[PDB]
Amino acid sequence: SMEQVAMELRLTELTRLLRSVLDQLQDKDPARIFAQPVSLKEVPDYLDHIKHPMDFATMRKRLEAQGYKNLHEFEEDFDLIIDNCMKYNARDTVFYRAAVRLRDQGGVVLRQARREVDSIG
Fold this sequence. Notes:
By secondary structure, the protein is mostly helical. 69% of the residues lie in helices and 0% in strands.
């Protein structure tokens, strides 16, 4: 149908905007601490601690399959990255501190993304 196509174009455009959002958030992680999944070869107990692992490469795969229906879904995944880290790692670690800085810096980007998503519909 024509409606299915229009819906698909909206999803494609959301995907375009989320790709730009994802790029901007990942720039706030210049150490690349959150770029890839935590290695289960190197942290073999990780899944005993963290039930829903997340990372920027895994988000990017979902994004490119147009797997985010709305900004809320994308934000859920970004929040997992931060929140997982802040649980597994102690306050005095470069990992925890990196997550805090990512959260604080990403807040700004996500604030305007929400306005853009609502504005353009």
